[PDB]
Design a protein around this ligand. Structure first.
Ligand SMILES: CC(C)CCC[C@@H](C)[C@H]1CC[C@H]2[C@@H]3CC=C4C[C@@H](O)CC[C@]4(C)[C@H]3CC[C@]12C
Ligand SMILES: CCCCCCCCCCCCCCCC
Ligand SMILES: CCCCCCCCCCCCCCCC
Ligand SMILES: CCCCCCCCCCCCCCCC
Ligand SMILES: CCCCCCCCCCCCCCCC
Ligand SMILES: [Cl-]
Length: 533
């Protein structure tokens, strides 16, 4: 149906990122700011970007020049954000490829621990209750000592891991020869593409719900502990997860909406897609936390200490689940194929959009003087060389710093706040409503206007100031304290995109003649936003 063509309601942000962020922040208290942000700023900004693209019929950069020439740095900020995100979004795919290649033997490597990479502290999970120190689980030991080979800190990069580097090269070469060729989909594969992840998720959920101790996991996942709400990090993580999953503030939704017709009702579509995305994110937590509760019951420890409080939660939990099913290798192969399929489509779309946006800036020297293939190869090679920094023995710390500052946090709240503020208080909410009534056929209600003028601005500014007043530095797995220069580099990563609006404002102000007031009054006037008809 239209849902099959719509897709996007499933992604790695729903399967890999939401459960680990919910588990890190206690679980249950994460859901109040999550839903508050979802119904206060998530859907309205998505609809605003879609409608701006549809109205202007322009991409992510040229659309802001026809609405407010002064505030034209939002497109450059989005370009920088997407460029930073494309570097580290593919290490997850590299890990999935490594796991898939490792799951082709007669026995799964993480089922038992008697191998070369194990330690004397390891014991089988089913025999821990017989005896009881510092004992460890075979699956965690596998993930930490065979795939990662963790070092004592970020300042100990150790040596490059050649198998992970080759997997990264393989996934980047898959991205190439497909972005270049242009093969995206057909009229027969989309039925299997959009149905396989849901079938796998249903199988995993059914398996998890029947395990002993699942009720404790559900209670942990659903009970809203209140005293955790005084920490700004819960609010920031819950708010930025919605932005990350919806792929807003990246310049992609504007381009997607630019392909719609002028007379098309996208309001109902933006609501359906958002609701389905949120529901898909919410459902898989049940399976994840039922598995976690079963593991806690089996090992005789707390649910808050069984697994990693970081990005490896899925790679620790899901293989444990597939080890409890008949024919485990078949299910492992299916699960990791599904993960790769989920990741590759988003990576393809994002890299293609970034390349198109970068080419559009210089159409003369990137279409005639230089071919597009050379530019694509250069971008891919630079991204691979940059991402080589996260496949060493101390690359997990570098990955955690880019997933906290590069494409989330204060940098995603800055862009959203400036978009909403510009639209609400310069162009005009009533003017935008008149346009929307012209296109979609009927006038919307007052929810979108108030979310653009009051709710989104207050939430963004309030969360930012709260974090600075009660400051707490970033940690890894609750125990690693990063050095000061690492925090400085992480903040520079966000500032590199945050500093795009004032600089463009200064350039525009200096590139005009006349009095200051005259200059400001001229760069604030929209320039024929809808020219078609
Ligand atoms: C005003 C427009 C039309 C033309 C001028 C565009 C200029 C002002 C914009 C476009 C892209 C922007 C740059 C994008 C990336 C970086 C890298 C960061 O480390 C320093 C800021 C810096 C250097 C930005 C500063 C301003 C910038 C150069
Ligand atoms: C450290 C992050 C770097 C991210 C780089 C993204 C692209 C930056 C260049 C964008 C276009 C600049 C030229 C625009 C001239 C009008
Ligand atoms: C024992 C488990 C298997 C470990 C070996 C990993 C294989 C890595 C695959 C990538 C090799 C291809 C290089 C790039 C293609 C030209
Ligand atoms: C004693 C050796 C120090 C090891 C630190 C190296 C860590 C790598 C961090 C660099 C990441 C690049 C960010 C800026 C480029 C976009
Ligand atoms: C009438 C003058 C309005 C000028 C608004 C300037 C806002 C500058 C940024 C304020 C803080 C935004 C934080 C968003 C979340 C990081
Ligand atoms: Cl989500």
């Amino acid at each position: 149906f239209v849902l099959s063509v719509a897709g996007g309601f499933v992604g790695l942000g729903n399967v890999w990122r939401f459960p680990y962020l919910c588990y890190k922040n206690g679980g249950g208290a994460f859901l109040i700011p999550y839903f508050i942000f979802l119904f206060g700023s998530g859907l309205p900004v998505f609809f605003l970007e879609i409608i701006i693209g549809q109205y202007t019929s322009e991409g992510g950069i040229t659309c802001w020049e026809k609405i407010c020439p002064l505030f034209s740095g939002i497109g450059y900020a989005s370009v920088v954000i997407v460029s930073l995100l494309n570097v580290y979004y593919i290490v997850i795919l590299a890990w999935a490829t490594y796991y898939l290649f490792q799951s082709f033997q007669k026995e799964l490597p993480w089922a038992h621990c008697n191998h070369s990479w194990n330690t004397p502290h390891c014991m089988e999970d089913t025999m821990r209750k017989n005896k009881s120190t510092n004992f460890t689980s075979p699956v965690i030991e596998f993930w930490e000592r065979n795939v990662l080979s963790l070092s004592p800190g970020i300042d100990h990069p150790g040596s490059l891991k050649w198998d992970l580097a080759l997997c990264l090269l393989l996934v980047w070469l898959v991205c190439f020869f497909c972005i270049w060729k242009g093969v995206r989909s057909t009229g027969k594969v989309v039925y299997f593409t959009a149905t396989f992840p849901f079938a796998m998720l249903l199988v995993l959920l059914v398996r998890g719900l029947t395990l002993p101790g699942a009720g404790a996991g559900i209670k942990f996942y659903l009970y809203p502990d209140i005293t955790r709400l005084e920490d700004p990090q819960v609010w920031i993580d819950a708010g930025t997860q919605i932005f990350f999953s919806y792929a807003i503030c990246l310049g992609a939704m504007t381009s997607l909406g630019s392909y719609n017709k002028y007379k098309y009702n996208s309001y109902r579509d933006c609501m359906l897609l958002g609701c389905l995305n949120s529901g898909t994110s919410f459902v898989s937590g049940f399976a994840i936390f039922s598995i976690l509760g079963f593991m806690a019951q089996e090992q005789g420890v707390d649910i808050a200490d069984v697994a990693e409080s970081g990005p490896g939660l899925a790679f620790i939990a899901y293989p444990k689940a597939v080890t409890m099913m008949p024919l485990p290798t078949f299910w492992s192969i299916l699960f990791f194929i599904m993960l790769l399929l989920l990741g590759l489509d988003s990576q393809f779309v994002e890299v293609e959009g970034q390349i198109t946006s970068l080419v559009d800036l210089y159409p003369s020297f990137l279409r005639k003087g230089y071919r597009r293939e050379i530019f694509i190869a250069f971008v891919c090679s630079i991204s691979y060389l940059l991402g080589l920094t996260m496949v060493t023995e101390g690359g997990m710390y570098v990955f955690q710093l880019f997933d906290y500052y590069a494409a989330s946090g204060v940098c995603l709240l800055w862009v959203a706040f400036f978009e909403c503020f510009v639209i609400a208080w310069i162009y005009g909410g009533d003017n935008l409503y008149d346009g929307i009534e012209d296109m979609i056929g009927y006038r919307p209600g007052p929810w979108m206007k108030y979310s653009w003028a009051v709710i989104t601005p207050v939430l963004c500014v309030g969360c930012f100031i709260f974090s600075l007043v009660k400051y707490v530095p970033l940690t890894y797995n609750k125990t690693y304290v990063y050095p000061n220069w690492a925090i400085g580099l992480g903040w520079s990563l966000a500032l590199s995109s945050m500093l795009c609006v004032p600089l463009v404002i200064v350039i525009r102000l200096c590139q005009t003649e006349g009095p200051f007031l005259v200059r400001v009054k001229y760069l604030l006037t929209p320039r024929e936003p809808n020219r078609w008809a």
